[PDB]
């Protein structure tokens, strides 16, 4: 009945020293029934990464929408959109459906190509921006992720240390949520290389 917890799933994003990380589980469900173990919730438009939890039809719709918009942005601006600018686009787009909203929990992650500065942001379903220095969490196990991140996180982690921290935050949060899990993906993002890692986890 609650649209934000029909399909399930989670996203977490973290900052480190000259890098950001974003990670998500792979479950799509119809309440108790597990449907797909390959439903990726992180997308990218150039070097800006967008994670989206919530109702899966809206996850897909918003990805198609922001691909549309960032493609037109690039043709007109003659440059790829930056994380700060994209965050405002996500907020505007969500708020224009204020009274019939997309049931989603978006998370932006990326590095500003000119300043080199790591950037993360989160939103509620109507577009209120949370621009955290440390971490952003989203989904049906957001409470669990808040708990993990708040204890596991420390600032200025190197990329390969940050990978371990975000992975253990996601995995152990997902294992305390019925509607999350069934595999996981972690993106480690540096200024001009991005590594994507699929994690091994319990399949129940």
């Amino acid at each position: 009945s609650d649209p934000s917890s029909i399909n399930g799933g989670i996203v977490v994003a973290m900052t480190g020293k000259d890098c950001v990380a974003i990670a998500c589980d792979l479950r799509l469900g119809s309440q108790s029934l597990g449907v797909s173990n390959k439903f990726e919730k992180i997308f990218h438009y150039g070097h800006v990464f967008l994670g989206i939890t919530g109702l899966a039809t809206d996850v897909t719709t918003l990805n198609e929408m922001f691909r549309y918009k960032t493609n037109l942005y690039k043709l007109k601006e003659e440059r790829a959109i930056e994380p700060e600018t994209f965050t405002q686009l996500v907020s505007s787009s969500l708020y224009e459906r204020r009274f019939g909203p997309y049931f989603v929990g978006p998370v932006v992650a990326g590095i500003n190509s000119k300043s080199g500065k790591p950037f993360i942001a989160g939103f509620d379903l109507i577009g209120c921006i949370d621009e955290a220095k440390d971490f952003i969490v989203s989904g049906t196990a957001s409470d669990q992720l808040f708990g993990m991140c708040e204890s596991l996180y420390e600032p200025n982690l190197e990329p390969e240390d940050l990978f371990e921290t975000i992975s253990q935050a996601l995995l152990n949060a997902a294992d305390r949520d019925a509607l999350s899990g069934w595999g996981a993906v972690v993106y480690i993002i540096k200024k001009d290389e991005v590594v994507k890692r699929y994690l091994k986890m319990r399949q129940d």
Partner: protein, 125 residues
């Protein structure tokens, strides 16, 4: 009490000329001189304040206008047409850009939007 002009007033003549555009350019030619120069660390725009009377306060008539905090405009030709274009240019910088992206448009895109408004007056009814 009807707007019955739903047809173009600017049309192609047999020679391929768009008469009203050419005539608009002639009106610009009669207008007072304005210029622009680009430096490495800046740009300058300038014009003559051609005062219609000495009793008029030429400070109140702004030929050089702020469009955004980092963009300015100057003209040659019909002043009233300029004034309404500045109003539309300021508003379009907000509605089609700042209210979407949370920042002011780059020069080329604001120019593109102004250009679009001027094109439409060249084809609309």
């Amino acid at each position: 009490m009807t707007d019955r002009y739903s047809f173009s007033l600017t049309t192609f003549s047999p020679s391929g000329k768009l008469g009203q555009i050419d005539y608009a350019l002639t009106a610009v030619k009669q207008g007072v001189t304005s210029l622009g120069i680009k430096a490495t660390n800046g740009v300058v725009i300038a014009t003559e304040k051609k005062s219609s009377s000495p009793l008029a306060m030429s400070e109140t008539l702004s030929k050089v206008s702020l469009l955004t905090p980092d963009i300015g405009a100057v003209y040659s030709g019909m002043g009233p047409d300029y004034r309404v274009l500045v109003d539309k240019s300021r508003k379009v910088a907000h509605t089609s850009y700042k209210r979407i992206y949370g920042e002011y448009p780059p020069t080329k895109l604001l120019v593109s939007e102004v250009a679009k408004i001027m094109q439409e007056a060249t084809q609309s009814g």
